[PDB]
């Protein structure tokens, strides 16, 4: 169980520490990420990464 709690505490670290730019990706806050792939309005793509912690 000592390694059980240490592995499960590292899964949580990756979720709260993984950060592109200043955005936490895997903590459930990166939702509705809109990429403007196109030169006009509405030429976007959405994306939602779920919370992936222990």
């Amino acid at each position: 169980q000592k390694e059980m709690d240490q592995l499960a505490s590292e899964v949580t670290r990756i979720s709260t520490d993984t950060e592109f730019n200043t955005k936490k990706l895997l903590d459930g806050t990166a939702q509705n990420l809109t990429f403007q792939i196109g030169a006009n309005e509405g030429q976007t793509m959405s994306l939602s990464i779920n919370k992936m912690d222990s």
Partner: protein, 55 residues
């Protein structure tokens, strides 16, 4: 004759007045063109508000 040769100066003094205006709008086009790149970059959601306000 002295009217048409003088009215030809007026026509050319209007050509200069018009070249100046469209010469100026030649740059409002470039500014508006650059101003449109700073809205396709600001629309991407990899930017943060610290960087949208930076744009």
């Amino acid at each position: 004759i002295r009217g048409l040769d003088m009215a030809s100066k007026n026509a050319q003094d209007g050509i200069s007045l018009i070249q100046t205006s469209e010469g100026a709008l030649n740059e409002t086009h470039s500014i508006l063109q650059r101003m449109s790149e700073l809205a396709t970059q600001a629309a991407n959601d990899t930017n943060t508000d610290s960087d949208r306000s930076e744009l």
